[PDB]
């Protein structure tokens, strides 16, 4: 192929070329050629979630900071990443990403009638969570809580309005979500139904 762009700057009298950037000598030449790998026949395909990961179901977090808690599934994003929120006013689990392999998908479904899918987007879009992580990593020292971005506080508040109202219509669902999951004596997970 060819990609030369031989421009012509002035320099007083209209001469000189200054060839394209990827056309000039390297100014440094290695003594040995690079490995130059072969071509790989591995094309990315979309992740296929499990049949039980219907949005609006209640999941049990098996690890992370919020292990044992019960949250509501909002949307499956990609590569096993789920977007969940156990309503912050119920069990204090903010909007958070969780890998689908570290959850248990129960048989309890919460109707999402009232939650706008428009706001589900623009937060499922990546870089939303780690936008200012590098900017805010001060650890030089009376410790204080890292104040949450007011944009995300408003975003969680908007989603919770519809979600909590639907949840409260079930007799024990509000208290069930507020509690945490633990294994007692005689509970065999291979035998326990979910």
């Amino acid at each position: 192929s060819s990609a030369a762009a031989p421009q012509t700057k002035t320099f007083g009298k209209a001469t000189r070329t200054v060839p394209h950037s990827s056309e000039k000598a390297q100014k440094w030449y290695p003594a040995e050629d690079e490995a130059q790998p072969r071509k790989v026949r591995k094309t990315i395909r979309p992740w296929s979630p499990r049949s039980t990961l219907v949005p609006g179901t209640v999941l049990i977090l098996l690890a992370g900071r919020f292990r044992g808690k019960r949250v509501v599934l909002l949307k499956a994003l990609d590569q096993g990443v789920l977007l969940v929120t156990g309503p912050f006013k119920i069990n204090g689990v903010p909007l958070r990403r969780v890998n689908a392999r570290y959850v248990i998908a129960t048989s309890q479904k919460v109707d999402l009638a009232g939650i706008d899918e428009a706001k589900i987007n623009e937060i499922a879009q990546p870089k939303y969570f780690t936008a200012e992580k590098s900017k805010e990593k001060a650890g030089e020292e009376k410790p204080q809580k890292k104040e949450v971005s007011s944009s995300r506080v408003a975003d969680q508040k908007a989603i919770d309005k519809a979600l909590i109202a639907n949840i409260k219509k079930v007799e024990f669902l509000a208290s069930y979500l507020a509690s945490s999951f633990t294994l007692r004596k005689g509970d065999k997970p291979h035998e326990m139904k979910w």
Partner: protein, 121 residues
């Protein structure tokens, strides 16, 4: 440095010691093949020492590579270290002993200009 290579897998990282070199002080630790007619090591009894053989050989791509990825070259002059001017990605200078303190400084000074690794700087 150390351009690129397959991982350096060593089939056996211990080494082979001579049979009964630990019990007797006259018997050195360097390997010697047991040639006795009743020797248990030579007969490969279960629970005894292993004998060196091909099969323990290192991969040809990584046979004489130090863990960084270079091969050691013994250097005793500023003129000797300049031989690796074109091989600084695969060979590393190793100033031999007997080189005085002054000549060691010059070799370090020159090998720094060539961007040649020195294993005993």
């Amino acid at each position: 440095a150390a351009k690129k290579h397959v991982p350096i897998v060593k089939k056996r990282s211990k080494g082979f010691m001579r049979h009964q070199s630990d019990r007797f002080m006259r018997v050195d630790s360097a390997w010697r093949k047991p040639k006795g007619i009743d020797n248990r090591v030579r007969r490969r009894f279960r629970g005894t020492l292993a004998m060196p053989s091909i099969g323990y050989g290192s991969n040809k791509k990584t046979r004489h590579m130090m863990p960084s990825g270079h091969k050691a070259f013994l250097v005793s002059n500023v003129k000797d270290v300049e031989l690796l001017l074109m091989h600084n990605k695969t060979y590393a200078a190793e100033i031999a002993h007997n080189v005085s303190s002054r000549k060691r400084i010059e070799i370090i000074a020159r090998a720094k200009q060539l961007s040649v690794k020195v294993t005993n700087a």
